[PDB]
Amino acid sequence: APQETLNGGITDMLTELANFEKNVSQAIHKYNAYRKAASVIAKYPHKIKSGAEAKKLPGVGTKIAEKIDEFLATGKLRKLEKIRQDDTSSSINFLTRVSGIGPSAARKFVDEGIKTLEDLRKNEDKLNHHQRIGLKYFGDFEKRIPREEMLQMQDIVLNEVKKVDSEYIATVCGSFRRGAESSGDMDVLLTHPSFTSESQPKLLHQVVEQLQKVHFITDTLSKGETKFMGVCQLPSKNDEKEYPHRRIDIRLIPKDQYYCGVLYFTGSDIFNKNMRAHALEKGFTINEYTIRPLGVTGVAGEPLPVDSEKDIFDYIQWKYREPKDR
DNA sequence: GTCGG
DNA sequence: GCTGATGCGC
DNA sequence: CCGACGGCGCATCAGC
Ligand SMILES: Nc1ccn([C@@H]2CS[C@H](COP(=O)(O)OP(=O)(O)OP(=O)(O)O)O2)c(=O)n1
Ligand SMILES: [Ca+2]
Ligand code: NA
Ligand code: NA
Ligand code: NA
Ligand code: NA
């Protein structure tokens, strides 16, 4: 990708604007608008000289163009400069860095005078369980996970899963599966022969239990029959520095919808929107669970059989790409 | 905010 | 007690 | 002008 010093000040402007829309203004769509604008501009292989130059790019409209002009002329953006010094909105934007605190909780806390982590720390009674864990691991959750540690984590997951029941299948997806050199967290996909569309008990629970029993999983954000979100930690040696606590999700999926899942939660997700927009073009409908053919109304028929990842490149006649190229 | 019926 | 809406992460 | 913009599981709130 192009270097930061081409339009980095712009791309950071747009991203900061993105966050205020999301966290303070509660305008999710303007947030994606700004993020879209920031993406296309980060992938632009040229140093932008005017707002009109930017506006040819798809996702950049009149208002972002004129923002780019003011920033190119002056180095800053008046509106952003203002929002940054604003105690209320500043804090609201900040508190959402806590996992479990979204725009609404954040606003509600700042209302009551709870503005900082110290204030949250002082008021444990007003946070839910997810929120206490997000606060407890605030720094660890912003740290990235080098591949070396994700491979040690992968080892522990595969070993313990196979130990519970040899017939479980577990693939680790996300950035890690696309060969990424670091990762934000660990997404694991799980199936079992005795779990399909028509359907045996506790398949997700026994796995989560074994990973607690050997102290890999240290806390639970949420858990149901289908999905687990929690916290985990690699053990360190005697006298060795403690490893940060890390986020791990585990999704239990039916056998037959498993490879559509693999694909979806592999991402990248900007390849995915690309892939189904092009699967609709060639007359197929894809989502996270299945591929189905449209009868051009378009009337999706039954979901088609899928036993590998590659099948969903056969149906679309798209030339296969493995995860690294995504 | 931006795109497109 | 229950169902449905909303917040959240993603 | 003006609606679409990702959709889904789980925790927890609102309401009956
Ligand atoms: N709008 C979207 C959003 C996500 N997706 C899917 C589901 S999750 C997968 C991307 O996974 P993550 O959000 O964990 O991100 P990454 O896999 O890149 O790793 P980290 O960022 O390191 O954590 O893409 C999609 O098809 N469309
Ligand atoms: Ca991930
Ligand atoms: Na944000
Ligand atoms: Na444009
Ligand atoms: Na948050
Ligand atoms: Na994710």
Report which bound ligand comes closest to the CA of A56: 4
Residue type, A49: K
Q: List phi, psi (to 5°) of A6.
A: -90, 105
The token pair that represents A306 in the structure block: 């899928």
Two tokens, residue A87: 């105690």
A184 labelled binding-site residue = yes
Which domains, ranges and CATH numbers included, belong to chain A?
A: 1-86 (1.10.150.110), 87-143 (1.10.150.20), 144-264 (3.30.460.10), 265-326 (no CATH)
Question: Residue A123: CB partners within 8 Å, gap ≥ 6?
Answer: A114
Whether A187 is in the pocket of ligand 1, judged by its Cβ within 6 Å, is yes
Among the options A22, A47, A67, A255, which is catalytic? Answer: A67
Kindly state if the Cβ of A184 falls inside 6 Å of ligand 1: yes
Q: List the beta strands (DSSP E) in chain A.
A: 145-146, 169-172, 182-183, 186-191, 217-223, 227-232, 246-252, 284-286, 291-293
- CB < 7 A contacts with chain D (nucleic strand): A 29, 32-33, 128-130, 222-227, 269, 287-288
Terminus-to-terminus CA distance in chain A, angstroms? 14
Q: Quote the ligand 4 centre to A302 CA distance (angstroms).
A: 39
Does residue A67 carry a catalytic annotation?
yes
Q: How far apart are CA A62 and CA A185, in angstroms?
A: 37
Q: Which residues of A11-35 are buried (b: 16+ CB within 10 A; e: fewer)?
A: bebbbbbbbbbbbbbeeeebbebbb
Is the Cβ–Cβ distance between A64 and A37 less than 8 Å? yes
Measured distance CA(A35)–CA(A12) in Å, rounded: 10
Given a contact cutoff of 8 angstroms between Cβ atoms, the answer to whether A70 and A17 are in contact is: no
Given a contact cutoff of 8 angstroms between Cβ atoms, the answer to whether A83 and A89 are in contact is yes
Tell me how far apart the alpha carbons of residues A249 and A157 are, in angstroms, rounded to a whole number. Answer: 12
Structure resolution in Å?
A: 2.3
- Select from A229, A217, A225 the least CA-distant residue to A195: A225
CA dihedral A260, A266, A272, A276 (to 10 degrees): -10
Q: Is A178 annotated as a binding residue?
A: yes
Q: How far apart are CA A166 and CA A146, in angstroms?
A: 29
